[PDB]
Design an enzyme around this catalytic site. Structure first.
Site, PDB file in Angstrom:
ATOM      1  N   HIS A   1      -8.222  -9.948   1.941  1.00 59.75           N
ATOM      2  CA  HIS A   1      -7.151 -10.439   2.807  1.00 59.75           C
ATOM      3  C   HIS A   1      -7.786 -11.519   3.720  1.00 59.75           C
TER       4      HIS A   1
ATOM      5  N   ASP B   1      -3.627   0.490  -5.577  1.00 59.70           N
ATOM      6  CA  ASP B   1      -2.098   0.344  -5.110  1.00 59.70           C
ATOM      7  C   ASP B   1      -1.631  -0.958  -5.661  1.00 59.70           C
ATOM      8  N   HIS B   2      -2.323  -1.944  -5.625  1.00 62.07           N
ATOM      9  CA  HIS B   2      -1.680  -3.241  -6.275  1.00 62.07           C
ATOM     10  C   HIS B   2      -2.784  -4.387  -6.097  1.00 62.07           C
TER      11      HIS B   2
ATOM     12  N   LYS C   1       6.070   6.942  11.729  1.00 56.09           N
ATOM     13  CA  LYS C   1       5.182   7.022  10.569  1.00 56.09           C
ATOM     14  C   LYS C   1       5.028   8.455  10.393  1.00 56.09           C
TER      15      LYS C   1
ATOM     16  N   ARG D   1      21.443   3.362 -13.283  1.00 52.61           N
ATOM     17  CA  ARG D   1      21.958   4.397 -14.462  1.00 52.61           C
ATOM     18  C   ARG D   1      23.395   4.238 -14.544  1.00 52.61           C
TER      19      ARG D   1
ATOM     20  N   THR E   1       0.596  -1.061   0.023  1.00 52.22           N
ATOM     21  CA  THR E   1      -0.149  -0.066  -0.082  1.00 52.22           C
ATOM     22  C   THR E   1       0.897   1.320   0.019  1.00 52.22           C
TER      23      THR E   1
ATOM     24  N   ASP F   1      27.437   0.547  -8.948  1.00 52.18           N
ATOM     25  CA  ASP F   1      26.752   1.438  -7.998  1.00 52.18           C
ATOM     26  C   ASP F   1      25.183   0.949  -7.791  1.00 52.18           C
TER      27      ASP F   1
HETATM   28  C1  LIG Z   1      14.490   8.096 -10.615  1.00 53.82           C
HETATM   29  O1  LIG Z   1      14.255   9.575 -10.564  1.00 53.82           O
HETATM   30  C2  LIG Z   1      14.834  10.089  -9.347  1.00 53.82           C
HETATM   31  C3  LIG Z   1      14.761  11.683  -9.403  1.00 53.82           C
HETATM   32  O2  LIG Z   1      14.976  12.231 -10.577  1.00 53.82           O
HETATM   33  C4  LIG Z   1      16.253   9.767  -9.393  1.00 53.82           C
HETATM   34  O3  LIG Z   1      17.016  10.160  -8.124  1.00 53.82           O
HETATM   35  C5  LIG Z   1      18.182  11.049  -8.173  1.00 53.82           C
HETATM   36  O4  LIG Z   1      19.274  10.382  -8.648  1.00 53.82           O
HETATM   37  C6  LIG Z   1      20.410  11.404  -8.827  1.00 53.82           C
HETATM   38  C7  LIG Z   1      21.538  10.515  -9.464  1.00 53.82           C
HETATM   39  O5  LIG Z   1      21.908   9.641  -8.442  1.00 53.82           O
HETATM   40  C8  LIG Z   1      20.892  12.081  -7.385  1.00 53.82           C
HETATM   41  O6  LIG Z   1      21.741  12.874  -7.501  1.00 53.82           O
HETATM   42  C9  LIG Z   1      22.838  12.668  -6.840  1.00 53.82           C
HETATM   43  O7  LIG Z   1      22.437  13.209  -5.420  1.00 53.82           O
HETATM   44  C10 LIG Z   1      23.664  12.889  -4.497  1.00 53.82           C
HETATM   45  C11 LIG Z   1      22.991  13.072  -3.128  1.00 53.82           C
HETATM   46  O8  LIG Z   1      22.973  14.578  -2.785  1.00 53.82           O
HETATM   47  C12 LIG Z   1      23.963  14.695  -1.763  1.00 53.82           C
HETATM   48  O9  LIG Z   1      25.215  14.114  -1.810  1.00 53.82           O
HETATM   49  C13 LIG Z   1      26.033  14.351  -0.578  1.00 53.82           C
HETATM   50  C14 LIG Z   1      25.482  13.905   0.696  1.00 53.82           C
HETATM   51  O10 LIG Z   1      26.323  13.412   1.638  1.00 53.82           O
HETATM   52  C15 LIG Z   1      26.427  15.809  -0.948  1.00 53.82           C
HETATM   53  O11 LIG Z   1      27.738  15.975  -1.291  1.00 53.82           O
HETATM   54  C16 LIG Z   1      25.639  16.775  -1.891  1.00 53.82           C
HETATM   55  O12 LIG Z   1      25.950  17.984  -1.329  1.00 53.82           O
HETATM   56  C17 LIG Z   1      26.025  18.965  -2.409  1.00 53.82           C
HETATM   57  O13 LIG Z   1      26.809  18.364  -3.643  1.00 53.82           O
HETATM   58  C18 LIG Z   1      26.811  19.291  -4.747  1.00 53.82           C
HETATM   59  C19 LIG Z   1      27.789  20.123  -4.443  1.00 53.82           C
HETATM   60  O14 LIG Z   1      27.924  21.210  -5.494  1.00 53.82           O
HETATM   61  C20 LIG Z   1      25.752  20.027  -5.163  1.00 53.82           C
HETATM   62  O15 LIG Z   1      25.290  19.883  -6.586  1.00 53.82           O
HETATM   63  C21 LIG Z   1      24.399  19.386  -4.301  1.00 53.82           C
HETATM   64  O16 LIG Z   1      23.336  20.295  -4.718  1.00 53.82           O
HETATM   65  C22 LIG Z   1      24.743  19.427  -2.844  1.00 53.82           C
HETATM   66  O17 LIG Z   1      24.679  20.827  -2.363  1.00 53.82           O
HETATM   67  C23 LIG Z   1      24.130  16.623  -1.593  1.00 53.82           C
HETATM   68  O18 LIG Z   1      23.703  17.048  -0.390  1.00 53.82           O
HETATM   69  C24 LIG Z   1      24.821  13.353  -4.726  1.00 53.82           C
HETATM   70  O19 LIG Z   1      25.843  12.738  -4.093  1.00 53.82           O
HETATM   71  C25 LIG Z   1      25.349  12.998  -6.333  1.00 53.82           C
HETATM   72  O20 LIG Z   1      26.601  13.533  -6.937  1.00 53.82           O
HETATM   73  C26 LIG Z   1      26.994  13.036  -8.036  1.00 53.82           C
HETATM   74  O21 LIG Z   1      26.731  13.788  -9.049  1.00 53.82           O
HETATM   75  C27 LIG Z   1      27.477  14.988  -9.083  1.00 53.82           C
HETATM   76  C28 LIG Z   1      27.058  15.935 -10.140  1.00 53.82           C
HETATM   77  O22 LIG Z   1      25.689  16.257 -10.275  1.00 53.82           O
HETATM   78  C29 LIG Z   1      28.830  14.976  -8.889  1.00 53.82           C
HETATM   79  O23 LIG Z   1      29.667  16.217  -8.604  1.00 53.82           O
HETATM   80  C30 LIG Z   1      29.250  13.950  -7.520  1.00 53.82           C
HETATM   81  O24 LIG Z   1      30.713  13.572  -7.428  1.00 53.82           O
HETATM   82  C31 LIG Z   1      28.528  12.744  -7.924  1.00 53.82           C
HETATM   83  O25 LIG Z   1      28.626  12.122  -8.713  1.00 53.82           O
HETATM   84  C32 LIG Z   1      24.079  13.408  -7.132  1.00 53.82           C
HETATM   85  O26 LIG Z   1      24.119  14.846  -7.196  1.00 53.82           O
HETATM   86  C33 LIG Z   1      19.392  12.919  -6.826  1.00 53.82           C
HETATM   87  O27 LIG Z   1      19.835  13.133  -5.490  1.00 53.82           O
HETATM   88  C34 LIG Z   1      18.246  11.821  -7.097  1.00 53.82           C
HETATM   89  N1  LIG Z   1      16.886  12.675  -6.807  1.00 53.82           N
HETATM   90  C35 LIG Z   1      16.220  12.131  -5.967  1.00 53.82           C
HETATM   91  C36 LIG Z   1      15.019  13.023  -5.559  1.00 53.82           C
HETATM   92  O28 LIG Z   1      16.144  10.938  -5.391  1.00 53.82           O
HETATM   93  C37 LIG Z   1      16.915   8.558  -9.786  1.00 53.82           C
HETATM   94  O29 LIG Z   1      18.153   8.519 -10.172  1.00 53.82           O
HETATM   95  C38 LIG Z   1      16.159   7.897 -11.078  1.00 53.82           C
HETATM   96  N2  LIG Z   1      16.188   6.453 -10.979  1.00 53.82           N
HETATM   97  C39 LIG Z   1      16.269   5.892 -12.027  1.00 53.82           C
HETATM   98  C40 LIG Z   1      16.576   4.388 -12.010  1.00 53.82           C
HETATM   99  O30 LIG Z   1      16.513   6.520 -13.082  1.00 53.82           O
HETATM  100  N1  LIG Z   2      -2.471   6.517   5.361  1.00 55.06           N
HETATM  101  C1  LIG Z   2      -2.109   5.316   6.229  1.00 55.06           C
HETATM  102  N2  LIG Z   2      -1.741   5.235   7.363  1.00 55.06           N
HETATM  103  C2  LIG Z   2      -1.543   4.184   8.226  1.00 55.06           C
HETATM  104  N3  LIG Z   2      -2.402   3.030   7.703  1.00 55.06           N
HETATM  105  C3  LIG Z   2      -2.960   3.035   6.450  1.00 55.06           C
HETATM  106  C4  LIG Z   2      -2.933   4.247   5.773  1.00 55.06           C
HETATM  107  N4  LIG Z   2      -3.698   4.024   4.518  1.00 55.06           N
HETATM  108  C5  LIG Z   2      -3.845   2.569   4.515  1.00 55.06           C
HETATM  109  N5  LIG Z   2      -3.537   2.127   5.824  1.00 55.06           N
HETATM  110  C6  LIG Z   2      -3.778   0.865   6.300  1.00 55.06           C
HETATM  111  O1  LIG Z   2      -2.825  -0.198   5.657  1.00 55.06           O
HETATM  112  C7  LIG Z   2      -3.676  -1.644   5.522  1.00 55.06           C
HETATM  113  C8  LIG Z   2      -3.478  -1.960   3.941  1.00 55.06           C
HETATM  114  O2  LIG Z   2      -2.212  -2.039   3.484  1.00 55.06           O
HETATM  115  P1  LIG Z   2      -1.635  -2.952   2.558  1.00 55.06           P
HETATM  116  O3  LIG Z   2      -1.875  -4.405   3.274  1.00 55.06           O
HETATM  117  O4  LIG Z   2      -0.291  -3.132   2.059  1.00 55.06           O
HETATM  118  O5  LIG Z   2      -3.026  -3.326   1.290  1.00 55.06           O
HETATM  119  C9  LIG Z   2      -4.919  -1.612   5.889  1.00 55.06           C
HETATM  120  O6  LIG Z   2      -4.792  -1.855   7.428  1.00 55.06           O
HETATM  121  C10 LIG Z   2      -5.157   0.310   6.110  1.00 55.06           C
HETATM  122  O7  LIG Z   2      -5.960   0.540   7.184  1.00 55.06           O
HETATM  123 CA   LIG Z   3      25.469   3.925 -11.999  1.00 57.04          CA
HETATM  124 ZN   LIG Z   4      -2.756  -1.931  -0.038  1.00 52.96          ZN
HETATM  125 ZN   LIG Z   5      -3.549  -5.398   1.732  1.00 53.91          ZN
END
Ligand SMILES: *[C@@H]1O[C@H](CO)[C@@H](O[C@@H]2O[C@H](CO)[C@@H](O[C@@H]3O[C@H](CO[C@H]4O[C@H](CO)[C@@H](O)[C@H](O[C@H]5O[C@H](CO)[C@@H](O)[C@H](O)[C@@H]5O)[C@@H]4O)[C@@H](O)[C@H](O[C@H]4O[C@H](CO)[C@@H](O)[C@H](O)[C@@H]4O)[C@@H]3O)[C@H](O)[C@H]2NC(C)=O)[C@H](O)[C@H]1NC(C)=O
Ligand SMILES: Nc1ncnc2c1ncn2[C@@H]1O[C@H](COP(=O)(O)O)[C@@H](O)[C@H]1O
Ligand SMILES: [Ca+2]
Ligand SMILES: [Zn+2]
Ligand SMILES: [Zn+2]
Ligand SMILES: *[C@@H]1O[C@H](CO)[C@@H](O)[C@H](O)[C@H]1NC(C)=O
Ligand SMILES: *[C@@H]1O[C@H](CO)[C@@H](O)[C@H](O)[C@H]1NC(C)=O
Length: 706
Positions: free
Chosen positions: A193, A236-237, A108, A590, A69, A586
């Site tokens: 369930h 959801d599922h 939570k 990607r 869920t 890693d």
């Molecule tokens: C699905 O979609 C989601 C969302 O788009 C994707 O999730 C994203 O993935 C990317 C790539 O992995 C993530 O970007 C990375 O972020 C990390 C973490 O950020 C923090 O890392 C450190 C904390 O200890 C810290 O160093 C950072 O601080 C600063 O870093 C720089 C400094 O200039 C700055 O740019 C930042 O803004 C911060 O101020 C930060 O707090 C980071 O470590 C990674 O850095 C890599 O890349 C940079 C260049 O951009 C490089 O310089 C580094 O050496 C390193 O290689 C990288 O930025 C991102 O956080 C994710 N976003 C979310 C919301 O989750 C996901 O990839 C997708 N999945 C698939 C399967 O495609």
């Molecule tokens: N926002 C929420 N916070 C806490 N429990 C939830 C929430 N939404 C659904 N549930 C509970 O999650 C269970 C269903 O989850 P699932 O078993 O994974 O299908 C039920 O017991 C719901 O009452």
């Molecule tokens: Ca990679």
């Molecule tokens: Zn459910």
């Molecule tokens: Zn359920």
């Protein structure tokens, strides 16, 4: 006449009452609504069926893994993979925080769990009010933002009161009225369930939920909004019937041990008891190997976190245990029979490609087409869809923006192909001629379009140096920075060893010589393009067509080309093949940067070698069997990301049935073409006649098991 009693009416233009500038968007969720329910019980659900018949429907909507869920409900509103938005499971644990997570728990409401950016947060940054009701993540404030109208989760609240609550909000003044709404019901998950997917209680539950939706539609009609609201009826599922006979207990292989903790279910994970003292110190690899191939037809399988199929996208999170378990349909796993809730009850959480794990999706309103049935799609795609319905710039998510344009009457966002960031250079003849030490036993544009009929793969790598090496049977994109082929494309029609030749176009490497490869070492070289093409094709024996490959993988790789590939060419009247190495050390899904690539470059046989973590292969054919891959009107794609392992423990080769375990491995590690694109930094089908939105639909597709 009630709304369900009235016939279909085309809402080409939104008919909104005064004080409304644009149609709001309501997200109505029905927990545990398996896709098979509407398929089978359509005659018992008159309200849901009309929304289907007058809206945009899909036979199956693929949810995220695991099928729970909270992860899915949060993935819907974030468009992110569970590994990225933080909510991995209903019950989980964070080592870096030393805290557990549960639905009935104080943790939570901790904002440190919820990552990413949900739609109501997105709407808030762009000055759009949102009123939610019992949606996962609504109680907690993310990025210091809360929905303008929210309600802390209380499952005791009657459903009828929930509908009226939303109906009351729709009447708020134009300045204080939300534009985005949510609705959640515990049915038919609850009845699912306790009695199973096939029961009288689910029928009673389905009918109950159906009448409840009918109440909403009558409520919208009495407010004059039945043709002024965008409704997304989702779930959801799915739901699967559990059994006592079909349950796995770890104690049978381990004993009544207390050093390990097991999160029970069809998607089991394992962590040590001494946590976080031994969270990383514990070697899971030994335990995983000690649990593999213990039964003749084992219904569970030990998986190290990076060794899971890439399609699941379930590795790159801190909260996910380094040891997971993949189970067969209708099977759950637990440590002891006491930990589990019950064995013979309806459950969920199984593989998201399973038939009964499929979810519901119905889009109704002025923005959705009427009576249109589309192909299956993931729930992470809905986030961008809602952004277009609310006029919002979407946060960076995992959904291909624009891939659902076929659902809308007038699509808002028009997608484009990713520009080529790669530094494309050319490789002429420059270095003649080294000795390979091998024993060998006894115009251009026409051949180009023949090898890449859908367009050459584009290099999304920045800023990688790539050369295009043309042959008479195939075209290969060679890397100068890694000194190995990135991809190799060729067309294989319906009916058409220790020796090698030096490619004078590429620089010589010590690993190109056959003297480098001994019959003792498990590491060897494989071909991206099969040499038995079209006498025997000699250009496939070029140095630029070899990649480092384990002997154990060659068992899979040879059978893939010698048996399956030829069969597929007869069944599909020829296939176009694109293959290449995959480097994701890693395990984020990607492609790796040059920095991390150098960190994982092992040294073997006195030479430095970068060995692939996986091997990708994309099979393309025509939707019309009368056409060859060179003349497709529409495409038929199927991609695979095969794990490159030194051994075949995953397959349980023991018993020696080679033709069995290989096909089962291929089908298991099937992936979206987008998955291959994301992990290799390549872009396919750019010169294809279909639009970008169509091509996004094609590349994000996956077949459902059973
Ligand atoms: C699905 O979609 C989601 C969302 O788009 C994707 O999730 C994203 O993935 C990317 C790539 O992995 C993530 O970007 C990375 O972020 C990390 C973490 O950020 C923090 O890392 C450190 C904390 O200890 C810290 O160093 C950072 O601080 C600063 O870093 C720089 C400094 O200039 C700055 O740019 C930042 O803004 C911060 O101020 C930060 O707090 C980071 O470590 C990674 O850095 C890599 O890349 C940079 C260049 O951009 C490089 O310089 C580094 O050496 C390193 O290689 C990288 O930025 C991102 O956080 C994710 N976003 C979310 C919301 O989750 C996901 O990839 C997708 N999945 C698939 C399967 O495609
Ligand atoms: N926002 C929420 N916070 C806490 N429990 C939830 C929430 N939404 C659904 N549930 C509970 O999650 C269970 C269903 O989850 P699932 O078993 O994974 O299908 C039920 O017991 C719901 O009452
Ligand atoms: Ca990679
Ligand atoms: Zn459910
Ligand atoms: Zn359920
Ligand atoms: C980890 O959590 C447990 C349970 O709350 C607690 O007993 C222990 O002290 C914690 N360990 C650390 C390092 O704080
Ligand atoms: C949950 O909702 C019911 C029905 O409105 C209500 O009676 C009850 O007080 C609520 N529980 C809590 C914890 O407030």
């Amino acid at each position: 006449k009630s709304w369900v009693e009235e016939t279909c009416e085309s809402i080409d233009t939104p008919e909104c009452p005064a004080e409304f500038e644009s149609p709001p968007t309501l997200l109505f969720s029905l927990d545990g609504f398996r896709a098979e329910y509407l398929h089978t019980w359509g005659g018992l659900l008159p309200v849901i069926s009309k929304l289907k018949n007058c809206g945009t429907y899909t036979k199956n909507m693929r949810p995220m893994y695991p099928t729970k869920t909270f992860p899915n409900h949060y993935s819907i509103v974030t468009g992110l993979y569970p590994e990225s938005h933080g909510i991995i499971d209903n019950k989980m644990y964070d080592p870096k925080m030393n805290a557990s997570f549960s639905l009935k728990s104080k943790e939570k409401f901790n904002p440190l769990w919820y990552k990413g950016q949900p739609i109501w947060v997105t709407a808030n940054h762009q000055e759009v009010k949102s009123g939610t009701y019992f949606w996962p993540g609504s109680d907690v404030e993310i990025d210091g933002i809360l929905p303008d109208i929210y309600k802390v989760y209380n499952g005791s609240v009657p459903f009828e009161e929930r509908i009226l609550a939303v109906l009351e909000w729709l009447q708020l003044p134009s300045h204080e009225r939300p534009h985005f709404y949510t609705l959640y019901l515990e049915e038919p998950d609850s009845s699912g369930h306790s009695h199973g997917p096939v029961s009288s209680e689910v029928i009673k539950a389905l009918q109950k939920v159906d009448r409840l939706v009918g109440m909403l539609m009558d409520g919208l009609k009495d407010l004059g909004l039945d043709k002024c609201l965008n409704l997304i009826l989702i779930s959801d599922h799915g739901m699967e019937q559990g059994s006592c006979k079909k349950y796995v207990y770890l104690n049978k292989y381990l004993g009544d041990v207390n050093n390990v903790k097991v999160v029970y279910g069809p998607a089991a994970r394992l962590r040590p008891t001494d946590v976080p003292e031994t969270y990383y110190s514990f070697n899971y690899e030994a335990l995983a190997k000690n649990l593999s191939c213990r039964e003749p037809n084992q219904h569970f399988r030990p998986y190290l976190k990076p060794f899971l199929p890439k399609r699941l996208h379930f590795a790159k999170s801190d909260r996910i245990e380094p040891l997971t378990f993949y189970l067969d349909p209708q099977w759950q796993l637990a440590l002891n029979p006491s930990e589990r809730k019950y064995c013979g009850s309806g459950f969920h959480g199984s593989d998201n490609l399973f038939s009964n794990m499929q979810a519901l999706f119905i889009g109704y309103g002025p923005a959705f087409k009427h009576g249109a049935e589309v192909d299956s799609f993931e729930n992470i795609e809905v986030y961008n869809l809602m952004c277009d319905l609310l006029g919002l710039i979407p946060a960076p998510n995992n959904g291909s923006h624009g891939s659902l344009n076929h659902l809308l009457k007038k699509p808002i966002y028009n997608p484009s192909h990713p520009k080529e960031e790669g530094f494309l250079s050319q490789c002429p003849i420059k270095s003649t001629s080294n000795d390979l030490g091998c024993t060998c036993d006894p115009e251009d544009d026409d051949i180009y379009h023949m090898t890449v009929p859908y367009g050459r793969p584009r290099i999304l790598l920045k800023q990688h140096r790539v050369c295009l090496l043309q042959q008479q049977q195939f075209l290969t994109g060679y890397s100068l920075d890694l000194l190995m082929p990135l991809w190799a494309s060729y067309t294989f029609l319906s009916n058409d060893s220790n020796c090698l030749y030096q490619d004078l176009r590429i620089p010589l490497s010590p690993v190109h010589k056959c003297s480098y490869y001994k019959s003792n070492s498990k590491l060897s070289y494989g071909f991206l393009t099969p040499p038995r093409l079209n006498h025997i094709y000699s250009e496939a024996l070029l140095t630029s067509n070899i990649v480092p490959m384990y002997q154990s993988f060659q068992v899979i790789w040879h059978y893939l080309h010698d048996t399956l590939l030829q069969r597929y060419a007869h069944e599909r009247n020829g296939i176009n093949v694109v293959s290449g190495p995959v480097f994701d050390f890693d395990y984020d899904g990607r492609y790796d940067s040059l920095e991390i690539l150098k960190q994982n470059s092992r040294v073997i046989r006195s030479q430095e070698i970068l060995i692939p973590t996986h091997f990708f292969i994309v099979l393309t054919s025509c939707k019309q069997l009368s056409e060859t891959p060179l003349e497709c009107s529409a495409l038929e794609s199927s991609a695979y990301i095969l794990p490159h392992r030194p051994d075949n423990i995953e397959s349980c080769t023991h018993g020696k049935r080679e033709s069995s375990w290989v096909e089962e491995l291929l089908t298991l590690h099937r992936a979206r073409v987008t998955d291959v694109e994301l992990i290799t930094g390549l872009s396919f089908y750019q010169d294809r006649q279909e639009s970008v939105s169509e091509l996004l639909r094609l590349k994000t597709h996956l077949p459902i098991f059973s």
